[PDB]
Amino acid sequence: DRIEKLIKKVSKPARLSVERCRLYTESMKQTEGEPMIIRQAKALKHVLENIPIQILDSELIVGTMLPNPPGAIIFPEGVGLRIINELDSLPNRETNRLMVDEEDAKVLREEIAPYWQRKTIEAFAFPLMPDIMQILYTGSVFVLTEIAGISHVAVNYPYLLRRGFRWFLEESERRIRALEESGVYEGEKYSFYQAAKIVSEAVINYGLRYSKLAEELAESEDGERREELLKIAEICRKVPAEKPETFWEAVQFVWLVQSALHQENYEQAISMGRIDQYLYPFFKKDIGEGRINRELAFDILANLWIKTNEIVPAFDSLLEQYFSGQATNQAVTIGGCDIYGNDATNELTYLMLEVTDRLRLRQPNVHVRINKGSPESFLKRLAEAISSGCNNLALFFDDAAVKALKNAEVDDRDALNYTTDGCVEIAPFGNSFTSSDAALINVAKALEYALNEGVDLQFGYEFGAKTEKPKFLEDLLEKLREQVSHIVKLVVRGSNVLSYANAEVKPTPLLSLCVEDCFEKGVDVSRGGARYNFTGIQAVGIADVGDSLVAIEGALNAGYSMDDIVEACRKNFVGYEKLHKLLLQSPKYGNDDDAADKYTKMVLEWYCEEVNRHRNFRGGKFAAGCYPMTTNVGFGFFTSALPSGRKSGEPLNPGVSPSTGMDREGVTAVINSASKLSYENLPNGASLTINLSSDVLGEKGDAVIEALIKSSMELGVMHVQFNILKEDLLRKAQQEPEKYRWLLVRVAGWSAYFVELSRPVQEEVIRRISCRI
Amino acid sequence: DRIEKLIKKVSKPARLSVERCRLYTESMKQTEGEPMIIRQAKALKHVLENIPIQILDSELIVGTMLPNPPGAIIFPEGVGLRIINELDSLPNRETNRLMVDEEDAKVLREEIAPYWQRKTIEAFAFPLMPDIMQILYTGSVFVLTEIAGISHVAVNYPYLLRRGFRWFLEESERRIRALEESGVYEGEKYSFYQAAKIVSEAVINYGLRYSKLAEELAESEDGERREELLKIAEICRKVPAEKPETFWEAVQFVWLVQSALHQENYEQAISMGRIDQYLYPFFKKDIGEGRINRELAFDILANLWIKTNEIVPAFDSLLEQYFSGQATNQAVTIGGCDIYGNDATNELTYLMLEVTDRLRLRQPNVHVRINKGSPESFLKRLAEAISSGCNNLALFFDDAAVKALKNAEVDDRDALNYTTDGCVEIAPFGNSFTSSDAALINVAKALEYALNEGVDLQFGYEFGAKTEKPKFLEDLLEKLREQVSHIVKLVVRGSNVLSYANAEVKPTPLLSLCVEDCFEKGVDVSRGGARYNFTGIQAVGIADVGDSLVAIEGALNAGYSMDDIVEACRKNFVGYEKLHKLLLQSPKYGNDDDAADKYTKMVLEWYCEEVNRHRNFRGGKFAAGCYPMTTNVGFGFFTSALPSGRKSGEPLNPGVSPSTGMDREGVTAVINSASKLSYENLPNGASLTINLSSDVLGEKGDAVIEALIKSSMELGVMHVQFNILKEDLLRKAQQEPEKYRWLLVRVAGWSAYFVELSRPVQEEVIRRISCRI
Numbered sequence A, B: 001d002r003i004e005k006l007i008k009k010v011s012k013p014a015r016l017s018v019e020r021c022r023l024y025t026e027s028m029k030q031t032e033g034e035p036m037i038i039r040q041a042k043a044l045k046h047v048l049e050n051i052p053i054q055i056l057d058s059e060l061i062v063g064t065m066l067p068n069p070p071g072a073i074i075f076p077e078g079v080g081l082r083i084i085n086e087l088d089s090l091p092n093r094e095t096n097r098l099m100v101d102e103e104d105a106k107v108l109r110e111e112i113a114p115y116w117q118r119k120t121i122e123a124f125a126f127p128l129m130p131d132i133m134q135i136l137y138t139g140s141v142f143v144l145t146e147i148a149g150i151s152h153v154a155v156n157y158p159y160l161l162r163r164g165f166r167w168f169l170e171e172s173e174r175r176i177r178a179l180e181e182s183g184v185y186e187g188e189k190y191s192f193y194q195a196a197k198i199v200s201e202a203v204i205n206y207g208l209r210y211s212k213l214a215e216e217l218a219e220s221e222d223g224e225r226r227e228e229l230l231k232i233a234e235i236c237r238k239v240p241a242e243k244p245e246t247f248w249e250a251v252q253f254v255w256l257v258q259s260a261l262h263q264e265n266y267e268q269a270i271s272m273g274r275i276d277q278y279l280y281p282f283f284k285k286d287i288g289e290g291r292i293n294r295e296l297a298f299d300i301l302a303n304l305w306i307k308t309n310e311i312v313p314a315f316d317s318l319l320e321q322y323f324s325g326q327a328t329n330q331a332v333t334i335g336g337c338d339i340y341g342n343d344a345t346n347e348l349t350y351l352m353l354e355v356t357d358r359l360r361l362r363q364p365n366v367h368v369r370i371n372k373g374s375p376e377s378f379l380k381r382l383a384e385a386i387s388s389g390c391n392n393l394a395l396f397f398d399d400a401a402v403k404a405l406k407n408a409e410v411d412d413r414d415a416l417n418y419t420t421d422g423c424v425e426i427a428p429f430g431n432s433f434t435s436s437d438a439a440l441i442n443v444a445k446a447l448e449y450a451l452n453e454g455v456d457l458q459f460g461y462e463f464g465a466k467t468e469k470p471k472f473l474e475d476l477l478e479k480l481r482e483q484v485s486h487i488v489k490l491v492v493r494g495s496n497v498l499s500y501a502n503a504e505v506k507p508t509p510l511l512s513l514c515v516e517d518c519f520e521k522g523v524d525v526s527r528g529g530a531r532y533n534f535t536g537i538q539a540v541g542i543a544d545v546g547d548s549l550v551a552i553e554g555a556l557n558a559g560y561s562m563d564d565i566v567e568a569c570r571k572n573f574v575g576y577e578k579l580h581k582l583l584l585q586s587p588k589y590g591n592d593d594d595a596a597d598k599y600t601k602m603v604l605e606w607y608c609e610e611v612n613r614h615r616n617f618r619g620g621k622f623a624a625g626c627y628p629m630t631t632n633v634g635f636g637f638f639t640s641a642l643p644s645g646r647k648s649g650e651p652l653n654p655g656v657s658p659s660t661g662m663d664r665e666g667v668t669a670v671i672n673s674a675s676k677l678s679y680e681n682l683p684n685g686a687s688l689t690i691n692l693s694s695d696v697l698g699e700k701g702d703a704v705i706e707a708l709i710k711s712s713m714e715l716g717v718m719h720v721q722f723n724i725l726k727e728d729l730l731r732k733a734q735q736e737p738e739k740y741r742w743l744l745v746r747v748a749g750w751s752a753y754f755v756e757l758s759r760p761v762q763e764e765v766i767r768r769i770s771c772r773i
Helices: A002-008 A019-030 A036-050 A102-116 A121-128 A130-137 A157-161 A165-181 A187-218 A224-238 A247-264 A280-286 A294-307 A347-359 A376-387 A398-407 A412-416 A444-450 A474-505 A509-513 A542-557 A562-570 A577-585 A594-611 A631-637 A667-674 A701-714 A727-735 A759-767 B002-008 B019-030 B036-050 B102-116 B121-128 B130-137 B157-161 B165-181 B187-218 B224-238 B247-264 B280-286 B294-307 B347-359 B376-387 B398-407 B412-416 B444-450 B474-505 B509-513 B542-557 B562-570 B577-585 B594-611 B631-637 B667-674 B701-714 B727-735 B759-767
Strands: A142-144 A331-335 A365-370 A393-397 A418-421 A425-428 A439-442 A532-540 A621-625 A689-693 A719-725 A744-746 A751-753 B142-144 B331-335 B365-370 B393-397 B418-421 B425-428 B439-442 B532-540 B621-625 B689-693 B719-725 B744-746 B751-753
Touching: A002 A294, A002 A347, A019 A036, A019 A102, A036 A187, A036 A247, A036 A509, A121 A130, A121 A474, A130 A142, A130 A474, A142 A474, A157 A247, A165 A187, A187 A224, A187 A247, A187 A509, A224 A247, A247 A280, A247 A294, A247 A509, A280 A347, A294 A347, A331 A347, A331 A418, A347 A365, A347 A376, A365 A376, A365 A398, A365 A418, A376 A393, A376 A701, A376 A719, A393 A398, A393 A701, A398 A412, A398 A418, A398 A425, A412 A418, A425 A532, A439 A444, A439 A474, A439 A631, A444 A474, A444 A542, A474 A532, A474 A542, A474 A594, A532 A594, A532 A631, A542 A562, A542 A577, A542 A594, A562 A577, A594 A621, A631 A759, A667 A689, A667 A701, A701 A719, A719 A727, A719 A744, A719 A759, A727 A759, B002 B294, B002 B347, B019 B036, B019 B102, B036 B187, B036 B247, B036 B509, B121 B130, B121 B474, B130 B142, B130 B474, B142 B474, B157 B247, B165 B187, B187 B224, B187 B247, B187 B509, B224 B247, B247 B280, B247 B294, B247 B509, B280 B347, B294 B347, B331 B347, B331 B418, B347 B365, B347 B376, B365 B376, B365 B398, B365 B418, B376 B393, B376 B701, B376 B719, B393 B398, B393 B701, B398 B412, B398 B418, B398 B425, B412 B418, B425 B532, B439 B444, B439 B474, B439 B631, B444 B474, B444 B542, B474 B532, B474 B542, B474 B594, B532 B594, B532 B631, B542 B562, B542 B577, B542 B594, B562 B577, B594 B621, B631 B759, B667 B689, B667 B701, B701 B719, B719 B727, B719 B744, B719 B759, B727 B759
Parallel strands: A331 A365, A365 A393, A439 A532, A532 A621, A689 A719, B331 B365, B365 B393, B439 B532, B532 B621, B689 B719
Antiparallel strands: A142 A439, A393 A719, A418 A425, A744 A751, B142 B439, B393 B719, B418 B425, B744 B751
């Protein structure tokens, strides 16, 4: 069958791809001194008209993301110069290896890198935040990702599918004329429609190139395959330019613009939204008009899922520690309700679960919305996939998610119709720009500053508020809240400068067509044309500070003073080995223990209310999230010992999941603990990962996992994801990695091949495998 | 069974009700000199706390619209003083008779009428448009209904059902405090929340009064009925104040606020929206939790449908000619698609069709959205009801309707999720104020002015543009377009003055809570707080001017001159009997004849583009509609003879339906003609009525009506409605009216009891019964 041929032709080693990077620069040199949005349009056009294209083995959906797939696309306007600086290490390094063709390694080092030097987003922002860039680079307090660009949005495909790109081209033309009739006093709006025109033409022509290759391959081909390539030629002539009428035409539409978007916007989290909802009209018409059958429809969706595995991120050695596991994350959202609360599961929802279950690949990040009205069969079928170790699903609970959005002042209907993107981030579908991973914040560092008068405990960094030495518990709490505030303020200032920087040196016109209000208002997405505008920033280490507070509570209570506890931390418990054992013995978040997990909850609420009050550059507000990527590990390295008994250098806790090995009452008790957090104030999402041994599942694999699903729904958690892991298979995968490179895990919000995770991160997924409950 | 007991207790003669009118005045006297929005709040409160209430025979849903039902509610702030001026004629007049208690007839004539004299909406607007009021009252050119108030909106029940009125009360209280903290510089916003508070309290207390009556009746009652009244007591204690959790709780919620709204806002078109979509979560939960069964659910909906028959309009003798047939029109919208295009028919859609089919009462105005993806069973089931003479359905075609809304600049999703209200008017659901019957315009009068240099042909009224005497056909067309323009401008000026007048003397705070953005922005609905703001104005006589143009074309062509044709018209074809026969013989709109129906289409497009360009007071734009009420008759009386051969005084054509007896090629050919009109420019709706003889249906009643349904969908019409009429039953209903007062007809967008239509209107429904196709 067809899937088998497709699966094997994305299992070959990945390369550092260069053709987008080159042709971009080539256009940007031809365009210097022109209006920047037109330059971006013209660059995107040039790459789409000149990138090598190929249709692959037995494909029904075409559009390689880069020529000769598995690879990394380079964005030197953003953060692609990070990776040029380490070209030697790329083919031989332990995680996310990329072969580099040495002929184009020369093209990067002396053609690309000297041009883009000081033409980047970071070059704009630097003189405006030099003090923030300095503390960013210490790796210890936060990371700001908007250096690399924005992305992180589920693309409004239903907006696109109701118009097609020939509409945009013509409408841009009507609007260019009308602007000229009024004497072009609206220069910005004019530049926009000029860009839109160009960018529409590019996309139309890009479909046309694949139509021509399909025709060229079919006069050289036999039987059924010749029938297929002639269909592909016919489809790609029509769509991305016209409104599609068939399901195949719709799925080929979305994938062309999806691959196109990846030439303009950087690799992170460009998602497809509620794909089961909006492909269903074409699907329902085609079945029962006989046009297609169920197995062809399956193969079509399979092809799409498989194609999103063509990218792998261009992360350097440092970025591999904080984002380990080949994180790109073109997400897909299935299931959920309509704008009335009715169940919106259709037959295409089930289909999409099946193709996900069969494929078990690292990508797409499949996100399943469930609620109290989801069909019982669908929950069973979800539980079967998860229990049989598919390890590639995430569950999103509608109740908590729409409550979060309503507090972020989203409309009823826009909250009900939400989508997901990236790992765990939630957003109104199609009319929002949420910059959903704009920063990640080490809140453990806040506590560290809070007991050392705004100095780093082991590094001498004066980055914190100038608080005093703490005495009692109660005035460490005030000092903590003040420090969280201070650190949040640092990233809100930083991200805003960066958002202005993006608007100025990297507007993104194609993406703008795909995000509602932008095209109609004639303002680019990076300037704020989306209806809702948000900036998602994330708390990491919420349990580490929570637990350190419980452990301080009891240690003062019986015996010790504050000065002891900070000195213990500074000295890494060397010479403090009695107290340290009492700290470690103290109650932990993750065990349904109110006296422990009330502190973590309170820490999150403080964080949330300190975030949600600030406004961003794009004219909306900031949005609080709690998910780690692998920055809980990265920040950990440079986090000192904290009064929870965590040793200096050790990993922090991931998302809203408890610290490693502190979950002694088991997996149901973790969920009870996690569902105590105020999700209603967390509108950028939360990551809860539950790791289960396969033996503990046993014969009743189904029953016990559906139990956990219905339990997390009833107790009101926002997000849950599961891992079914066999420990010595994971041990054997360290030993012979290429033999076991099919081994899938959920890291902290996304699927990675276990082999591609670093040693600290691997050791963490192994140690978090739970047996109780 | 229960329905039978309920049906018979709204068949008694109607009264002129006075208790709302009185208690309103009573409060308004206590409140003089206070902020008008607070006065309106306090008045509404006073009536809801003091109106006599009663639970009726075997009711499950309670909330009489007026004490002792069938009746008219009087709004002296609007147009209720019209009817006091004719108190003597009310119990003994031929249509819409109202018994008047002579004790409260004295209260109207010397307590109500001298107070409200010059405190009305019209009193505000008069000095600002005295020239328009003068030409309004000649009845000949347009009617402006906003003298009477606004209404005409489908109420946002899902907004309400997700909050409940205790939320509003408390939120108003938080917002009143925060306004005070900032020193109340936002006085208007402050007045608003003050009103909202008051109006929420009123509604909570109003539910509580019905809870107490239910408790009082149940300590005096037996068995099953005592079980029911105790449930009603329990339900009305909880809801309108809390979010409902059961289906019965939901339906009782909506009806309480629905009856409440009718004490604040005048009788026209306060509708319930997509009721099948938003009651379905409660329904689906209750079935299969055993809470309710299918027959109880039926009875609950039956009770609601039956209760909307308690009102009958307070129209005087002149208003009865232009709005004959007891038009109030609490509409209900079932069927249609979601915001993705998927079919949104659920089991509750079918239920609602069934209760409609069984009841066959004049009210609710049931509106069925269908599209190309509607289930085949549902179309069959619609066709069965219609063919069996139910005569109480209207069909709305999604394709044409969402295209109309998108051109009015409605968002994709808001257009897909549209609702209907009144007769045929369409609107984004829940976040719009469209004033959907704000005016009706006699476009035949435009043509009359167009060939008499802006003078009325038989009345000497100089109300038209000062055009010249027409010579050729081509320069009568220019002169026509200019005259349509001139007349539209007159009503846009008039309606805007009136809309400002409403905002000033009749803000409507309860209704404001129910229309989205209003409460959140803290601005009343009449001031423009709704997300979309529109003003619906209607063309009447589009075929009369269309046909007069074809008839002018051929009459000039062969022989005659322009001066002849106008003189013929002025002289009512007396002395012009040859030419008149040629005019009558000329091609007519309604027969699929391009040479005829191209003129009508063009007339509508001119009208539409002249309307849709003007902006209203509430900060949106005007919206073009084409439906008559019975003003096609009323305007007819005072319309002179026109070159189509229509005699002076005769009725004009209704909606987008052809002139009476000009539809010689039959019913399919009428639909082809009607589907040539540009619906994409008609965003306030169109009325097409198809009248069929029951014999012509024959044994294949189903087949031939589904044929017409699928034909009107395929040919792209906006709205169609059907009548199955037996001619001599209608003849017998003139003879013995009270014996035949159950006889239902669709007038031009709504159901009336044939007995309640005037002689000119009755004669029209009889003569329009078609036999061909």
